[model samples]
Target: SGAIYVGNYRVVNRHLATHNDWANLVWEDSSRDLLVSSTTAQGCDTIARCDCQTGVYYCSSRRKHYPVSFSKPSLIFVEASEYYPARYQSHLMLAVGHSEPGDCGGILRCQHGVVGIVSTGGNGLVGFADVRDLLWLDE
Candidate 1:
């Protein structure tokens, strides 16, 4: 029902157009929380309760625990125009989405409260499992 400023951008919970996936944050205790993502797409379309400790994320989805990182975790709004090459763009990218009742492109992988842009030639899928403390920014 509110928004917060991450740098110059005001962020809030926004609805995605396609709803290909959804993610949520759950606090386990004072010291840790869980980040989970799920989809109806093919394959193992889920990451359930990945642990976060002191901003570090650990996942064992492949049956092996590994460290993943989400430098700055916050709800970020992005548009398809921001991406240069098309293939590297995520399916989550939208042509133009408004932020009011929280409809947006998706969350961004950030650092120091700044939205992180995707430049890799690969699909720009920021691992939600790697994000921690995102609940701290919730208003």
Candidate 2:
């Protein structure tokens, strides 16, 4: 998603998306939190991995970052949020569970990789900030 009115702040390295059904926030001027070793989830990279057998004849096959499973209950089918330019497809949510203010910044932990985080939701089905779409930002 791109420029979703309330979108992820890449500049500040903070999570944002269909957010809290609440009021705006005001941060502490002197508070500093993020640092090294803080990112608990591993980042996804574009380097394609071989999808064919190791002993196979000359082959050229790949997958979308390797189709592994459940790294935080696993987001079934995800995509960019509404009104944002579609760049990536990612999601992690439940039909019933945490989908509120504090849940916004939590990671969409794909087993261990930090593919994205809780951006927003409705009735529990959450929308995430897919780091795949965000990967280009850091570069």
Candidate 3:
């Protein structure tokens, strides 16, 4: 998948779509951690592979770091509460999940409150509780 750049930050993940018989994923310019001597799952770069002499292709053991100079406000899908302060009300978060099928296209919530949900498409604003829940799936 392509790197999503918002502001100065970019969102890169392991999940992507494949065509034909292979997946369109690649890793370039990777480094191994000196402390561990080998990369682990937490530091693994699911998008690309490492350049170590391990004679392995697509090894999920090591990780690659694609450090983009300046970036935007990058985010993770879990633990929404830990970073809620950075998000504002009426903010449109692009492709929240791994961009999988049936996933919520975007996330909208109160800037100062914890009221929000996954939205299917661009419709009317999700105002207060009095409005009807209007949502549809993508084709």
Identify the runs in model 2 with alpha carbons over 4 angstroms from their true place: 1-96, 137-139
What overall lDDT, based on C-alpha atoms, would model 3 receive against the true structure?
A: 0.20
After the best TM-score superposition of candidate 2, give how far the Cα of residue 35 lies from its true spot, in angstroms. Answer: 16
lDDT of 1 by residue, 56-122 (tens): 1112222222222333333333333331222222212111211221112233322233222111111
Off by over 4 Å in 3: 1-5, 17-100, 112-139
Tell me how candidate 2 scores on lDDT.
Answer: 0.30
Q: List where candidate 1 sits over 4 angstroms from the true fold.
A: 1-61, 78-124, 129-139
- What does candidate 2 score on TM? 0.32
Model 3 C-alpha RMSD to native = 20.4
Greater-lDDT candidate between 1 and 2: 2
Predicted model with the maximum TM-score: 2
Any residue pairs clashing in model 2, and if so which? 2-84, 71-110, 71-111, 78-90, 79-90
By how many angstroms RMSD does model 1 differ from the true structure? 15.1
Model 1 Cα shift for residue 27 (angstroms): 12
